Amino acid sequence: KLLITIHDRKEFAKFEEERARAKWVYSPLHYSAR
Amino acid sequence: PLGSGVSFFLVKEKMKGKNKLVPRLLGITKESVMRVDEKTKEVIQEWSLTNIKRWAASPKSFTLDFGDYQDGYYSVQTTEGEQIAQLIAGYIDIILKKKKS
Structure with a gap:
């Protein structure tokens, strides 16, 4: 049998973890103010 | 046919139920x-380019935010x-430069 050890948990975690630590960027189309 | 110069990026999309990532092709x-x-x-x-409200780019994962189109949010592993x-x-x-209001 194949057992995942320090690979899938790390790859998925970092993936998710990074989502919350990502900077958001808005487009000028929505914000039309000076 | 229209399609001379499409930017394709190799990204991994997570499946529902199984905590794994699969390689998928995305045309921008x-x-x-x-x-x-x-x-x-x-x-x-x-999705349309003008429909995108905001977007977040991480070193290993890209995040997308749609206004009144997608219920949730599109988040996958980008290279x-x-x-x-x-x-x-x-x-x-x-x-915006071509069609300014």
Whole structure:
């Protein structure tokens, strides 16, 4: 049998973890103010 | 046929139920973003460039935010977050300069 050890948990975690630590960027189309 | 110069990026999309990532092809144009299936090589779902409200680019994962279109949020593992983010921004600028209100 194949057992995942320090690979899938790390790859998925970092993936998710990074989502919350990502900077958001808005487009000028929505914000039309000076 | 229309399609001479489409930017394709190799990204990994997580499946529902199984905590794993699968390689998928995503086509990004100057009009809209479409998702192509790596196995069938066909467009599954696509979103307009003007419909995107905001977007977040991480070193290993890209995040997308749609206004009144997608219920949730599209988040997957991207190999080139900076390249994709820059490409999207440029397309929006070109449209605004051509069609200004």
